[PDB]
Structure 1
């Protein structure tokens, strides 16, 4: 024996040196891991803040877009109602109102004034109005001597004429062209 002990101590020393080197490298690696995962934890923590902020802006946006969608839908329906109901300056097909109409100063057709303000200062004619048979080519016989029937005919036609003047006046008054 004797020799075996020296051999054993040397080989134990060899293993000790191997353990020492491997522990050193483990220590290096773990010290390296400590810093890096700590950095990751801080990076993850910071990311949650940003994601939370973004979530706070997305649900806000989703609400505003929904509100705007409602406003535009309302607007589109107001436009559609107007489009069907408004009186156009350019439309060529005759347009009709369900109401009376009042305008300032004049009504015109094709750019020339045809209707204005009511003409006042009229005293309404009285008597009979003639809207019946009326012949403007009615003539009258006039002899060289006085004939009652011929003067009666003239007077009769004067009456029918005055009664037709009143009838026309009545029509103007009823419309409102004169007072």
Structure 2
């Protein structure tokens, strides 16, 4: 019961109902021959022919009007279908317009973030590269130190290709053994002795003088002060005393 535009209505079937002339075809023999002119006699029969023909035309026009109407009804159904489909497409397309506009803007936004990221990556590679070179270098210096340093914990003897100077003292076993050079010494004149020497030499001594005895005493002293010159020579050569 929706819209009823003027002039609209489905096909009117009555348009097909034919008018049927009920008058019997005119036979000249029923006409007034004495009283009607010949021209009027011809006119009456002619007008009789026309009435019948015009009825044919009117019936045909009605039929043609009906076909047009029936076709209109069918095109109205199609127009309505077309109308529904267009309205839905317009809605679908309007929805797409927005989603496409948002996608395009999300793409532009992603590009900025990736371009930034790319920059950070480039620098990170630069920093890691350089770092690698420094680590390799430090690592070489380390192993180089490890093969050349003196260990406080090594148990096997270690040697130095150089002389050594220490502060205030040397010790072994935790006991001082050597210190600063002992000064205040005057060098011993004379000829040192390092040859044979028997510290268990006895000296006989009698009740009366005896040159033999006393000589062996002063000589054992000479050989003694001399070996003492020797020991001193050795201690000064090292540097333990002045």
TM-score, structure 1 length as denominator? 0.92
Residue among 142, 151, 156 paired with 1:88: 151
Q: How big is each residue's C-alpha offset from its partner over 1:119-155, in whole Å with a ceiling of 9 and x where there is no partner?
A: 1010010121111111111122223333333322222
The ranges of structure 1 where at least 4 consecutive aligned residues each deviate by more than 3 angstroms after the TM superposition are: none
User: C-alpha separation between the residues in 2 aligned to 1:139 and 1:156?
Assistant: 13
1:61 matched to which residue of 2?
124
- Other structure's SS at 1:122 match: coil
Deviates more, 1:1-10 or 1:32-41: 1-10
Q: How big is each residue's C-alpha offset from its partner over 1:99-121, in whole Å with a ceiling of 9 and x where there is no partner?
A: 11111111111111111110101
User: C-alpha separation between the residues in 2 aligned to 1:46 and 1:83?
Assistant: 55
User: C-alpha separation between the residues in 1 aligned to 2:171 and 2:116?
Assistant: 66
Q: How big is each residue's C-alpha offset from its partner over 1:60-114, in whole Å with a ceiling of 9 and x where there is no partner?
A: 2222222222222222222212222222222221121111111111111111111
Bigger CA radius of gyration = 2
User: C-alpha separation between the residues in 1 aligned to 2:229 and 2:129?
Assistant: 70
Q: How many residues align?
A: 179
Q: How big is each residue's C-alpha offset from its partner over 1:11-44, in whole Å with a ceiling of 9 and x where there is no partner?
A: 2222222222211111111111110011111111
1:171 Cα deviation from its structure 2 partner: 0.5
- Other structure's SS at 1:77 match: helix
Deviates more, 1:169-178 or 1:47-56: 47-56
Structure 2: gaps (5+ residues) = 1-63
Deviates more, 1:67-76 or 1:125-134: 67-76
- Superposed, which structure 2 residues align to 1:27-176 within 5 Å? 27-176=90-239
- Other structure's SS at 1:85 match: coil
- Other structure's SS at 2:171 match: strand
Deviates more, 1:142-151 or 1:64-73: 142-151
User: C-alpha separation between the residues in 2 aligned to 1:15 and 1:27?
Assistant: 18
- Other structure's SS at 2:192 match: coil
User: C-alpha separation between the residues in 2 aligned to 1:131 and 1:29?
Assistant: 124
TM-score, structure 2 length as denominator? 0.69
Deviates more, 1:11-20 or 1:45-54: 11-20
Structure 1: gaps (5+ residues) = none
